[PDB]
Amino acid sequence: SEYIRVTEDENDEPIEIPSEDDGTVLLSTVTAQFPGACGLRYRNPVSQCMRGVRLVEGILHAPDAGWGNLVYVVNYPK
């Protein structure tokens, strides 16, 4: 039952987004909860700077360090 936590505000309580069997997350799993979302970002706990999730053909790839216990934030266009 592996998942990642996604919110549109670190203020708000996040939603649990299930991962696939290969450990990736489908953009479609995110957009079902956050229609219009064009990607994920998180605070790098080392740099304390915001950091992007790799996205290739509707597939979100875990950071090299793994998904971990991080809260991910959705990006929308304007």
Author numbering: 2 to 79
Copy text from the publication.
A fragment of TDP-43 comprising residues 1-270 including NTD and RRMs was used in crystallization experiments and the structure of the NTD (residues 1-80) was elucidated at 2.55 Å resolution. The protein appears to have been auto-cleaved at N terminal to RRM2 during the 7 days required for crystallization to produce diffraction-quality crystals, whereas RRM1 is conformationally mobile in crystallo and therefore not visible. The TDP-43 NTD crystallized in space group P212121 with five identical molecules in the asymmetric unit. The NTD adopts a similar conformation as reported in a recent crystallographic structure obtained in P63 space group (Afroz et al., 2017). The head-to-tail interfaces between the molecules differ from those reported previously (Afroz et al., 2017). A sulfate ion binds at the interface between the molecules and is bonded to Arg52 and Arg55, which serves as a wedge, increasing the distance between the monomers. This binding of a sulfate ion to Arg52 and Arg55 rearranges their side chains preventing strong bonding between Arg52-Glu3 and Arg55-Glu21 reported in an earlier NTD structure (Afroz et al., 2017). The changes in the position of the monomers against each other alter the superhelical bundle arrangement observed previously (Afroz et al., 2017). Each spiral, with radius of 46 Å, has 10 NTD molecules in a full turn with distance between two rings being ~36 Å. Analysis of the structural changes on sulfate binding confirms that ligand binding at the molecular interface could change the nature of the helical arrangements. These head-to-tail interactions that lead to parallel spirals are consistent with the view that physiological TDP-43 oligomerization is mediated by its NTD and may be key to prevent the formation of pathologic aggregates.
Mislocalization, cleavage, and aggregation of the human protein TDP-43 is found in many neurodegenerative diseases. TDP-43 protein has several functions, and its modular structure facilitates this multitasking. Two centrally located RNA recognition motifs (RRM) strongly bind UG-rich RNA (Lukavsky et al., 2013) or TG-rich DNA (Austin et al., 2014) directing TDP-43 to pre-mRNAs and intronic sites (Tollervey et al., 2011). At the N terminus, a ubiquitin or dix-like domain (Mompeán et al., 2016, Qin et al., 2014) provides a polymerization surface that enables formation of dimer and higher-order oligomers predominantly found in the cell nucleus (Afroz et al., 2017).
